[PDB]
Symmetry: D2
Subunit: 325 residues, 4 copies
């Protein structure tokens, strides 16, 4: 079983831990976090977004017992002090965010870990991966620090990939309607629509390089707790109807992007996609086409759960290629 450590216990770290503890192919050996075992067990068991954890979560002496398995707990702010060599850590998931991600990852390597998965794109990682888009690019012999991009990029890239490979993309603009996770952001008070910048369209370069200059956009932060939406207005290179666009997505969801992209013909609201494991769910009832070429596509994503499921999928892909190069 691949041996994994998790650094940082924010929402992504906790969701990844929840999902990995259910994977019997993965052994979560250790956690490095800022809090005591009792606080960590509380945070694992209870969650205001995804509900209570199904398995038994129990705090012990500098460890957790989760689903019957022991997980060691550490509290090191300098990652190169961690006992990763002594624990034979195969993969560290670096879940403390964007800030100095590459330095932290190198710290984990210096501590004896073999590979690091970053949770942010464009940190000078050896390779940027979006599952369903370019995971084939991972070389276990050449790639040591691997990025899983971001949640919005994990939604945007498969959608855009389907569109470009079926119809060709001329150019497009997008709005990502973002749940909660710049004077505008600082004056929020959790009550307003807030326009901000987004980096998902630029991060698209890392996984679909032939497409930069073609897409850009902004974010609208809205006061919903979780679940976000990509609103993409894109011009295609060939004539389409809404039904043809939806059929391309429907076919990708059942084949090449199975488990990553899904397609829905149901009249759902954003809350219905809470704890959905897909990277993107096309809302088939809203697809629009103006003058056969200008296409509006709406894609739902749980900006926490889908990304964490992709992180676990990536752990499994990397581990398989580590044992069988």
């Amino acid at each position: 079983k691949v041996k994994v450590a998790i650094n940082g216990f924010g929402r992504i770290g906790r969701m990844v831990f929840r999902k990995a503890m259910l994977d019997d192919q993965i052994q979560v050996v250790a956690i490095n976090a800022s809090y005591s075992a009792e606080t960590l067990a509380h945070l694992i068991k209870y969650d205001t977004i995804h509900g209570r954890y199904d398995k038994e979560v129990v705090a012990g002496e500098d460890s957790l017992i989760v689903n019957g398995k022991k997980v060691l707990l550490l509290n090191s702010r300098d990652p190169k002090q961690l006992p990763w060599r002594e624990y034979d850590i195969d993969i560290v998931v670096e879940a403390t965010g964007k800030f100095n991600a590459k330095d932290k990852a190198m710290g984990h390597i210096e501590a004896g870990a073999k590979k690091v998965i970053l949770t942010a794109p464009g940190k000078n990682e050896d390779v940027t991966i979006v599952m369903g888009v370019n995971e084939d690019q991972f070389d276990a012999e050449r790639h040591v620090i691997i990025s899983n991009a971001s949640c919005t990029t994990n939604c945007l890239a498969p959608v855009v990939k389907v569109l470009d490979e079926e119809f060709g993309i001329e150019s497009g603009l997008m709005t990502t309607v973002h749940a909660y996770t710049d004077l505008r952001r600082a004056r929020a008070c959790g009550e307003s629509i807030i326009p901000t910048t987004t980096g998902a369209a630029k991060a698209l370069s890392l996984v679909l390089p032939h497409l930069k200059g073609k897409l850009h956009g902004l974010a609208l932060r809205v006061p919903v707790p979780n679940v976000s939406l990509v609103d993409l207005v894109v011009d295609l290179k060939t004539d389409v109807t809404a039904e043809e666009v939806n059929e391309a997505f429907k076919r990708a969801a059942k084949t090449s992007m199975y488990g990553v992209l899904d397609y829905s013909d149901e009249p759902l609201v954003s809350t219905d996609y809470n704890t959905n494991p897909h990277s993107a769910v096309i809302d088939g009832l809203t697809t629009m086409v103006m003058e056969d070429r200008k296409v509006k596509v709406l894609a739902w994503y749980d900006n926490e759960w889908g990304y964490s499921c992709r992180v676990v999928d990536l752990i499994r892909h990397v581990a398989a290629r580590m044992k069988h190069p």
Copy 2:
């Protein structure tokens, strides 16, 4: 002074009443509503969206005393029973919504009112007006039932008019991010992003006829109390930069669309536009241009206050043309 009655005391009726009671050029003679004077005075004085009313509001015997002036109160469900002939009502504002608006308006005419302003587009009105766009079309000798369109159309039409007259519009799609005012709408529970249909782009035909087939869109209802946003992605017929688009809006706001359209270079959030009297406020900091032609424009509007101010402006325009044909 032009003599006005208001039918219906929902949020639009109450906001229009608040604004008209401040206009010394307008005499609000009467109100027809479903509640007693005490309840109406409560609803006039207090408002969870726009705050407490500034003037003294007092309930009397089947009347209100507001800002020192008496307003008669009626409770007729059939508008042709109203004493509009006996009160010399010049204009009735029909504020009970879209349902059977033309029948209600004819009822007010049969009761003796001279003109009716509907608060919804496409009700077979004699003319559809958006102030700043086509108010010149009103003929006091030929037009008896007049529509002020809708709040979203009052935002979209001036923006689109500036764009078309300065640069020409090829085609475009829009999202209106709507505050609160179909299985999706029924399953809301006030907590989700809800995609729905919108009729603002189609209602554009009534005030800018040369532009239909060129624009369509959808709505995203989000749980904010008030203030909404038009997110327009439009292709233009000539090369532009973001600065040139913003300068066109800035020039229209200070001249041809003064008081109707405004332009902001400040980093504001949606709540900062609460009780803003403009039909649309361009957010200059978010304007984007892809490949010199594909333009993203964001326009804020208080979907209640701006529309009600336009209703009062229209009352004044119609009354001026009634006295001086």
Copy 3:
């Protein structure tokens, strides 16, 4: 297996159906609702509060296939037209609310059902039951129309019962802080704290008659989607400490009120009690005692899930006593 029908498919009807379809001791033969099978299947599968249903939900010809079992669907507004005699319906759960509940129940009896469970107290039912408080009072030979009280009464009555039997209650006042489910209620706009009346303290008379005149209170509706709170300030007849009060609750939760009342020493928030099946969960960390006698107790309850679980428990209790009088 006891044969059950459900009348009305609001949130309580749907939650009860979800829970009963999992109970292999209960056969849900039929549903009477206002919508078609496709809409009902949508509403069963998806829920903005409690998430997606775990089992396969599928719509057929005037029926549903849920978890592999067929459920017949009817659309009768007059309950005495229903084929309950032909289906051998043992128990009808009347889930259309308070309005004319007894008339509806009699209609179900006239249609051939043997017993009816109302979802509201004080409707001239033969007996009012709160599980854990007085279910022993049900007589299968004398009681035909049975009430499960209300969600707030199902929280308040076990708490008050523990307090009265351990320490004696002199008098008390309560506030129920209520999630969303009178000029104040009509002016809401989903954004305010709204004081209203509550009938839970009066409904206490029906299940704990020796206690009326001793308790009354009000409600504060707050804009949270689900999960509510009883804030009880009660004077006791003997000296206590906070620890003794909490120990009384802790002992009741593990014995006489097992499955109905629970006790928590964890620092949780309201959202952590979403889809909790208990009628009440004492928040042990907030219990307060002033001058040894005046006690503040806080009790969480999911105002939907706990009540629906109690409805299913009551179905099982009634059915057991029907087969073994």
Copy 4:
């Protein structure tokens, strides 16, 4: 005119500045804040809670021009470096919160200010003042550092004072239902009811010393933007009815507590008290009495605006006693 400086530009500092700039008896000479003049002018002009500022707000070179008057701007983190002696500052309002308030105040004294008003109780101030309760205690010759208590204490103390002086208070418990401004607080996500501690009942000792041991309580943080509520359950020393309690409050509001406490017989919601200048508004329709002695009283307060108005009232009281000892 009394010369005032404001230290700290959080919400209380900004609201106090807004109110003081309207007072022609007060000269706001300077502000010490963490941001540039342009950012400060933005924050003064726009506010997501209380709306846009009425007066002209303009940023100049290390100054603001507000309502036509110039206000100097400083950016000193050490208050004893401020030029208060050179500006003849009479009163500094210390609006950076509870943390090290007395040290900051002494710093302002060392810089040359004559008096300091703290915005938190129990900081070893020379005197704690609640306007309407004990402002008579201020001695301009003996008191140099003055506390205006807290917003919740400014609501609780006048209510409790009326009750104790009219009927006598035996003991009581309270809940303060608090808008947004401990594992529970850290796991919020702005969506839950959160029980926390409150210090308002203990701070009552400072302004009504004969009453400690008699009152204590907790807070329930609820996701409303502004406006909070005190829910007080108190036993009195003499028999009362709800009408007598409400009449005591009504008489205090029109006499001894004019401008501080108000009384409402209207069915309002919390949002209707936004930007209300009173310290407390009794909700007369919810007052309850159990067994002639146990009284429930609900008191609304804008936890920002009322407190800031009290701060300005205190500035005026202190200045009057400074010039006329």
